[PDB]
Amino acid sequence: MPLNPHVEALLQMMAQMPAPDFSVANPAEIRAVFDNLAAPPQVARVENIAISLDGRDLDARLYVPEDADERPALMVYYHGGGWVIGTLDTHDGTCRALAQKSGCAVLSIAYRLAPEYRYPAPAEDCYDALVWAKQNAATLGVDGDRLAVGGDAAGGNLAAAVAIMARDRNGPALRHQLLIYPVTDNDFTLASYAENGGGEYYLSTDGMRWFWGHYLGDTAAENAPLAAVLNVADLSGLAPATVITAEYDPLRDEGIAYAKKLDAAGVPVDAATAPGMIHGFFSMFEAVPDSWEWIERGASNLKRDLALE
Amino acid sequence: MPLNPHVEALLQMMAQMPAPAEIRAVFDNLAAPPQVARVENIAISLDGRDLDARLYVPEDADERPALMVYYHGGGWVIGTLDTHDGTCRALAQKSGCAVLSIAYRLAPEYRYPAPAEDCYDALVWAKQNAATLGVDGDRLAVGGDAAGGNLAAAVAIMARDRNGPALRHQLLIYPVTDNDFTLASYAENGGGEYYLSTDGMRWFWGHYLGDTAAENAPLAAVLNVADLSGLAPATVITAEYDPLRDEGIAYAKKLDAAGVPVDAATAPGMIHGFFSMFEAVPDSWEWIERGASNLKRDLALEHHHHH
Ligand SMILES: O=C(N[C@H](CO)[C@H](O)c1ccc([N+](=O)[O-])cc1)C(Cl)Cl
């Protein structure tokens, strides 16, 4: 029986990886190379946390990075997955990566998912969770005065909405919003949807129709102000943003767009499209070494806006 | 910029894989660590030393589940709770049993027999502290991959010889059982193009034994133990393109010959370490499932009427 084709593709992929050319095979070197290969990014502590809110319990996970401060700043993170899928486990690597590179604690929220809980519910979970974290800051062991929200894809959509909710509802003061290739609108005619939406690049335009439909259900996009945050008339007074888009992401244009509108309304923004990258690439750092550059970039903005002043 | 070549290689890797509640069931389980209900970082205080441990309790385990005590691989020199986290989650999930992953002390800092005595002592702790762990101390099993399967095999032998915890199973995943590098699979598979090399194994063995000759290390080269009878029923899963294939098979044959019930097979087309590769190689799941299924059978819950 010949080599399993997938094992072959794995071996090829391991072979095209950045050499760690330690000059000699001693136990410390071999250990570092195997840990780099086979373990998720190291953090000091990971705590499975139950968040009891009015009406509902949400699972969450606290990541505390090695060499963080006594009481580090916190970013409350919202996984992506089109408001329909995604778990704490699918984004465990991404949260660890961000925590490691920012030196910030990261609290990842398992908000309730559509269609079971259609739009207003998931964003209310995410907002109520940021509130919970603020009010239980000392109990988590973090500084609730240095708060951020972040998220990828649908999660970036939720983080933008929470930032809006926190400004409108006069909630937790946020030092940053980290938006990683975020969903911002349901206009599927955009250039990048034609260019990138065929399914060739993981995420497809039809996927996004499917997601949006499950999230909104019977609500009209126009009657869903925290869904298409791109359509929010006024984006002034929002937390400083980082908006990283990907070149071959169907969401690229609308994400780029939102960043422009934030910059228009006065919000400080670092905004970049990652060359050669697809949707979901923050989560692909194990196979795509170049993902780390952009992870480091976003975390570097967080580390700056969350500094103990 | 052109599409990133690592990204493009990843994309064709996904494309190379065949095929709301059902949709989540699939996509949540690709490129992600398998979900379990509870994961607890545990410290084990033994005589002379404290070991790190991690307890995995899967979804839909019994009120007081069976326990497999698991020993990671890494040639007795490398590996952590973190490097084998994914593997432990997969086995807990597919078996329905709790899994206790043990961070035994590593060679060359701690040479044979130290890592083995850690692994045995951790089993005895787990049985003694079953109420503390919330598991059923009468439904115990050991397991491990590579040098971890070696340690599991050695522990099953020690538990037998020392009137130690009764074991219902030993799951041995492409185990190291001997340092005979003359064997066929080393010549065929031990070149280095298949992850593990004969040279790698020499290195590991050198670090593990130190000055001690193999002939004086029966709990290391378990293939040189005379009487394997009365040992825990075994699963021994080897890999076609693994240098360790042949000594794994040999150990299985000797288990069987001694009257130990053994499920033994060679995963066709697979390399050393493929149980840990299930995110990239979904066909690994077939073998994970078989191994975990044998665990589940031998760690069977007792009868309870439901009326
Ligand atoms: O023993 C070794 N690796 C073993 C292979 O069994 C280890 O079990 C392992 C390999 C790969 C892996 N992964 O890619 O997640 C995890 C563990 C050495 Cl050759 Cl580095």
Which residues does chain B have within 8 Å of residue A16's beta carbon, measured at their own beta carbons? 5-6, 9
% helix / strand / coil in chain B, to the nearest 5? 40, 15, 45
Residue B300: other Cβ atoms inside 10 A: 11
Cis peptide before B108 (omega within 30 of 0): yes
> Token digits for B54?
């991690």
Residue of A nearest to B32 (CA): A90
Kindly state the tokens that stand for A30: 């071999």
Q: What's the CA gap between A147 and A192, in Å, rounded?
A: 33
| Own/partner pairs, A49-58, CB within 8 angstroms, 24+ separation | A49/A107, A49/A140, A51/A109, A51/A129, A51/A132, A53/A125, A53/A128, A53/A129, A53/A132, A54/A128, A56/A112, A56/A125, A58/A109, A58/A110, A58/A111, A58/A112, A58/A125, A58/A129
Counting every residue written for chain B, the total comes to 307
Q: From the centroid of its chain, how far is CA A261?
A: 20
- CB-nearest to A288 from B1, B10, B24 is B10
CB contacts, 8 Å: B38 with chain A: 48
Amino acid, single-letter form, for residue A10? L
Closest CA to B191 of B178, B182, B200: B200
- Cβ–ligand 1 contact at B74 (below 6 Å): yes
Residue nearest to atom 3 of ligand 1 (CA): B74
CA trace torsion A224, A226, A227, A228 (10° rounding): 90
Please name every residue paired with B83 in a beta bridge, in sequence order, or none if there are none.
none
Instruction: Classify residue B276 by burial, with Cβ atoms within 10 Å: 0-12, 13-18, 19+.
Output: buried
Task: Write the DSSP assignment of B123-163 as a string of letters.
Answer: HHHHHHTHHHHTS-TTSEEEEEETHHHHHHHHHHHHHHHTT
Report strand pairing: B140-145 vs B67-71: parallel
- Can the peptide bond before residue B165 be classed as cis, meaning omega within 30 degrees of 0? no
- Torsion angle of the four alpha carbons A96, A102, A106, A112, in this order, in degrees rounded to the nearest 10: -80
* Cα A15 from Cα A35, distance rounded (Å): 17
Q: Which domains does chain B have, with CATH numbers?
A: 1-307 (3.40.50.1820)
**3-state SS of chain A?**
CCCCHHHHHHHHHHHCCCCCCCCCCCHHHHHHHHHHHHCCCCCCEEEEEEEEECCEEEEEEEEECCCCCCCCEEEEEECCCCCCCCCCCCCHHHHHHHHHHHCCEEEEECCCCCCCCCCCHHHHHHHHHHHHHHHCHHHHCCEEEEEEEEEECHHHHHHHHHHHHHHHCCCCCEEEEEEECCCCCCCCCCHHHHHHCECCCCCEHHHHHHHHHHHHCCCCHHHCCCCCHHHCCCCCCCCCEEEEEECCCCCHHHHHHHHHHHHHCCCCEEEEEECCCCCCHHHHCCCCCCHHHHHHHHHHHHHHHCCCC
Residue type, B251: Y
- Helices A92-102 and A291-305, interaxial angle, to 10°? 60
Q: For atom 5 of ligand 1, which residue has the closest CA?
A: B273
Residue B145 contacts residue B73 (beta carbons within 8 Å): yes
- Residue A33 Cα: closest atom of ligand 1: 20
Of B158, B71, B67, the closest CA to residue B117 belongs to B158
Q: Give contacts of A289 with chain B, Cβ < 8 Å.
A: 6
Contact A40 B82 (CB under 8 A): yes
Q: Is B198 in the pocket of ligand 1 (CB under 6 A)?
A: no
Query: Which of A7, A16, A31 lies closest to B9 in CB terms?
Result: A16
- Nearest-CA residue for ligand 1 atom 2 is B74
CB B206 within 8 A of CB B76: no
For residues A19, A22, A28 and A33, what is the CA-based torsion angle, rounded to 10 degrees? 0
Question: What number does the ligand 1 atom closest to the CA of B197 have?
Answer: 19
Bridge partners (DSSP) listed for residue A48? A61
Contact B79, A37 (CB under 8 A): no
Cβ neighbours of B74 in A, within 8 Å: 34
| Tokens describing residue A178 | 């980290």
Q: What is the rounded distance in angstroms from the CA atom of residue B218 to the CA atom of residue B299?
A: 28
Longest Cα–Cα distance in chain B: 67
Closest CA to B102 of B131, B133, B136, B61: B133
Burial level of A152, CB count in 10 A (0-12/13-18/19+)? Answer: buried
Dihedral sign, Cα of residue B9, residue B10, residue B11, residue B17: positive
Alpha-carbon distance of B190 to B184, in angstroms, equals 9
- For ligand 1, what atom is nearest to the CA of residue B196? 19
Place of tokens 């009257």: B259
Q: Which of A190, A193, A212 is nearest to A201 (CA)?
A: A193
Contact B271 A7 (CB under 8 A): yes
Q: What string of H, E and C letters represents the secondary structure of A236-300?
A: CCCCCEEEEEECCCCCHHHHHHHHHHHHHCCCCEEEEEECCCCCCHHHHCCCCCCHHHHHHHHHH
The verdict on a CB contact (< 8 Å) between A16 and B34 is no
Q: How far apart are CA B100 and CA B95, in angstroms?
A: 13
Which runs of E-coded beta strand occur in chain B? 38-45, 50-57, 67-71, 98-102, 140-145, 169-173, 234-239, 262-267
Q: How was this structure determined?
A: X-ray
Structure tokens at B133: 């762990």
In angstroms and rounded to an integer, the radius of gyration of the C-alpha atoms of chain B is 19
Burial of A13 (0-12, 13-18, 19+ CB in 10 A): middle
Which residues, at least 6 apart from A227, have a Cβ–Cβ distance to it below 8 Å? A119, A123, A157, A161, A186, A212, A215, A216, A219, A221
Q: Are A104 and A136 in contact (CB under 8 A)?
A: no
- Which H or E run includes B95? helix B85-95
Closest CA to A86 of A215, A205, A252: A215
